[PDB]
Each structure stands twice: as C-alpha cells, then as structure tokens.
Amino acid sequence: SKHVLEDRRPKIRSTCGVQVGTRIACADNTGAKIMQIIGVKGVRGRLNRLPAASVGDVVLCSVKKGRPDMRKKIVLCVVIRQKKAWRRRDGSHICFEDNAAVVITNKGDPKGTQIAGPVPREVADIWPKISSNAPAII
Amino acid sequence: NKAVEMTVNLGKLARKASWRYKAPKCIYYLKKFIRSQFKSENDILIAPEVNKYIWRHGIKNIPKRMRIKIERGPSNKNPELNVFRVCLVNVNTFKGLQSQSYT
C-alpha cells in the first residue's frame, strides 16, 4: 500500500523459485547489488506459507547492499531470473544462473537504463519496457 | 522319477527379502519356489554345496542366477516318503541355458 503498482500486470504461472527472505541479485544499474525479498505483490496469503514469486512477478525488496542512497530502502522490483527450473508453456524447461530482479517504478517502468544478463520470454511478454533494457531475450 | 535341471533367479525369488538378510531368505524363497513348481509337500533337502553357493559373498550379496538340479527320490530316513534333493550345477555361463529334465 505504501508501494503501489499503479497498473497491475498479468502473471505467468510457473514454479516459484524465490520467496520472502530470498536474497536476489539486482540486475539493473540503479546502484543496488543484493536485495532481500520483503513481500510479493498480489499474493493472497495462506496459513504458514511464505509468499513466493516466479519470473515476471512484482516483488518488494530491501536493498541489502549497494549504493548508500539505495541501501536500507524498500523498493519495488520485478523478478527476471530464477535458479529454479520452470516448465514453459510449450513444455520445455529453462533454468537461469542466478536469482535476479529489476527495480521498477510505480507506473511499471524500470528505474535502471540497462540490465546485466538476459531475460526470458516471460519477462518480455509481460514487461516489454523491461526487456528492452536487456541485451538478449531467451 | 525325473531330474529337473534349471536356472533359478535368486534376485527375483528374493525381491521381497530384506537386503540385510538376502541369503537366509533366499533359502526360504527357494524352498517355497520348489513347492509351487512341483505341486508337492515333500521335504526339500538343500545340498550343502547349494547353500555354500548362496552364502558365497555373504548375507547381502547373493548371486543373481544359480543352476540347480532337483532329484525326486525316497527319503533316506524313511523310504515311504519321497523327498526333493536340490543339488548345485556348476556352470560357466547362464546365457542361453535351457531347463531340462531326464531320469
């Protein structure tokens, strides 16, 4: 509620690889390096279940290390990479090397101007503004 | 009074045995196999060379296959009652061996 996403996007159901408490890399050049997941946007919540996210999902994160103006701040980000292999819609399985997210604004546009590493087609389908800042879409 | 010479798969006979006690239960599943194969309740005399073959690599590592020979005959204790004598057949390979019977 303090960090609204003004236009909410569709979600792609896949195996959730990150959770609340997962330390993830920050892929863009916002100055954040490692963020820890505080919450997942959209999660209704079940008893004892930690809210878990997959790629393309909007995630709240506290910057655990990075630039001094960026650290210790709750931020909105979109999960773009995931170490857990997930089944795609065509039925193949894809695994990324790290757990990475990209800081976005409240309107859904990325804060950074470039992204280190690739994104999959899932992030490209939901977030065309994010995947434009990435080098390759896989 | 035939003599059946056949290959038994001690792995398959003792699948439901514990891995820890594969050898003594293999004797149990073999004698249970002979009774179901020849529908009889005569005793099965397991020759000590058969038992030495089964315990060859200890209690867990039983050999997979084993060629035996079953001799129906009268009991040396009481000749009124027939008995099965399982004797061991030393074979170099099991590839292609067919079960046979003769007198």
Binding site: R46, L47, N48, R89, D90, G91 | -
Partner: protein, 363 residues
C-alpha cells in the same frame, strides 16, 4: 475461543467418509438428459486404462505450440446383449421389463460365477414366442437402457476373460424407436467411435489407486507437527474440543486412502484411434503405433480401439473405467490439432520415438 489464524479445512467433506468402493466396476449413476429431438445414440461406454503419454498440439489463440499430458483408454467394442426398460414411478424408477438375448457367451457368464472353472455353467439356460410380448411391454417404458458387456479377452494383457456388464441408456426420440434400435443391436458389437467423437467432453467414472490405511498427513494434507513433537509428528494434534464430548466426523483421522469412486468431469477426447493401425499427423510424417517403445509400463500394447483423453484418468492401468457423455451440454469450441504424439519409451526416459530410430543411432 477462536483459533488465532484462520485456514481452510483440510480435505473435502464431500468425499468423507472415505471408504473403499463397493466394486471395481462402477455403474453410471446419472446419464445425460434424454432429448427426443436428438437421434438415437448410446450415452456411455466402458474402457480400460492403458497408460499415459503426452501429445503436442497447436494452440491457436497467433499459433503457440503447447504440449499436454494425455492418457490412452483401450476400448474394445462392447456387445449389447440385453435391454432394460424403466417406468417413472412416484417412488422413482422401476424395472418395467428385462429382455435378454437368447445367446449369452462364456465371457459374460463368467461374471455370474465366482469360481467359473469349478462351475457347471448352467446360468441362463433360458423361448422366442414371448419376444413380441416382451418387446411390447418394453415399448411402454419411459427409460430404455441396453445391457452391454465388455470384451475383456480382446485386450489379453489383462488376464481376465470375465466380462464387465453394465446398463447404458439409449437416448434419442420416441421410446418405440428406442427399443426397435435396441432389438436390432442385440448380440452386436458397439464401437467406441459410435458412442463418442473427438474434441468432445466426457465424464470418466472409475476407482482410484488404492493406498491402503494412510495417516492424516497423506489422507488430508494436515501439517506435520514440529521436530520436538513427542508421540508422533504426522498427526492432527487436537482432535476436538472438550464440548461436544465426542469427536466430530469433520476431524481428519487416519484411515483408508484411495480405492474410492471418482467421477471427473469434462475430460476432453483428443483422439479416437485403433491400436493396430499406425497414426500419422500432418506435421510428423512417421507411421507409428500408439504403443510406446517397450510397451506401456505395467500394461503392454494396445491392440484394440483406443481413446486418447486429455489429462490423467482415475485409477491404475488395466482397471475398467466408465465413460459417459457429460450431463450438461458442454461442447468444445476449440478444434484439437494434434501435432505430434510422444511414443518414446516411458520406461526410463526414452529419447527415440521408434525402434528404427534407436537402431539407426547405434548402427
């Protein structure tokens, strides 16, 4: 007092008491609504679960290729050998007249015996002068069902010659014409293609895989107690309040799991084919059987007509399975275009589609 944090109930009360099913063959408890302007057709069939594979199909929305698990239900044709007529009584439905054929073979009269090998086979010794009198009272019925049995010997992997008998409702128009069709179809085989077609939704009725006596964690999915728990962790901890001074039936207790009757709705038929003929799709130009390499695991090979159904099917393989038309009128707007059928070996994880593809790899 109130529980501190609310959660949904573990497991549905709609399926409690979880008892064993009374039989392995399940009768159709409800057929679809008989419409007199519809043509005459049967409404159910009895198939046998062979196994699963996955197909690849083009999912038009642009075209996106998707793969989906299917399951293959072998369906030898069922022989119609009797007619049952019903009347609408104020107590419900009542048997108006049962008309059997003069011929009942060794398969279907194996069902009437517990030990058939020791039997004298004298069931159904059974006149044709009373046929027209029995057809006439059958025309006074409200509901017409045929007595059909399965041909289980045609599968031959199931070591069962004993047939499964069931009533299948004849839906169509003008009960006169229902029994005139039914006396025509006596001692005749009914194909699976006559009853169902592709991309139509059906309900499957069967008995699930039995799991035996199971604890509450498998039977209901209750949370495993923490590591410190004395007297066991795979339990429900509090089985009730002090008052009411009994245990409620809504509390998960350990018991029988599986071997329950289940009806699953809206299972889409992807393909109706025959196990002998080799399938070819528009995109995969290889003639191959529906049987994967090495046969279906714990089933064998399909030699009869088969039913390819999207998803999973209740129960283990070789178990009989009732399949009826859906009781609501639900049609598939999509047209299933199967691009590819995986006939790879399901033993292990096979990478070849045919044995010729394997023999070409190794020389």
């Amino acid at each position: 007092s109130c529980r501190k944090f609310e959660a949904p109930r573990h497991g549905s009360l709609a399926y409690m008491p979880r008892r064993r099913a009374r039989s392995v063959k399940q009768s159709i408890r409800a057929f679809e609504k008989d419409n007199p302007e519809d043509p005459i057709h049967l409404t159910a069939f009895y198939v046998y679960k062979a196994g699963m594979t996955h197909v690849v199909r083009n999912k038009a929305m642009t075209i996106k290729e998707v793969t989906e698990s299917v399951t293959i239900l072998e369906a030898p044709p069922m022989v119609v050998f009797g007619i049952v007529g019903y009347v609408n009584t104020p107590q419900g439905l009542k048997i108006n007249k049962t008309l059997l054929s003069s011929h009942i073979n060794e398969s279907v009269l194996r069902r009437f015996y517990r030990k058939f090998y020791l039997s004298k086979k004298r069931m159904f010794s059974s006149g044709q002068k009373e046929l027209d009198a029995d057809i006439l009272v059958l025309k006074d019925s409200d509901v017409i069902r045929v007595l059909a049995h399965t041909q289980v010997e045609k599968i031959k992997s199931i070591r069962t010659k004993k047939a499964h008998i069931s009533e299948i409702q004849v839906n169509g128009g003008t009960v006169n014409d229902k029994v005139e069709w039914a006396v025509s179809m006596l001692e005749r085989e009914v194909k699976i293609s006559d009853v169902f077609s592709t991309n139509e939704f059906v309900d499957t009725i069967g008995v699930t895989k039995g799991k035996g006596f199971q604890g509450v964690t498998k039977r209901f999915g209750t949370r495993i107690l923490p590591r410190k728990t004395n007297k066991g962790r795979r339990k429900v901890a509090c089985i009730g309040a002090w008052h009411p001074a009994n245990v409620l039936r809504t509390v998960p207790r350990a018991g029988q799991l599986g071997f329950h009757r289940r009806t699953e709705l809206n299972k889409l038929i992807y393909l109706i084919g025959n196990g002998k003929e080799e399938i070819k799709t528009d995109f995969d130009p290889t003639l191959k059987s529906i049987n994967p390499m090495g046969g279906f695991p714990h089933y064998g090979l399909v030699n009869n007509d088969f039913l390819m159904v999207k998803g999973g099917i209740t129960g283990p393989v070789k178990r009989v399975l009732a399949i009826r038309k859906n009781l609501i009128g639900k049609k598939n707007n999509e047209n299933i275009q199967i691009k590819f059928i995986d006939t790879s070996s399901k033993i292990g994880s096979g990478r070849f589609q045919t044995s010729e593809e394997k023999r070409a790899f190794f020389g």
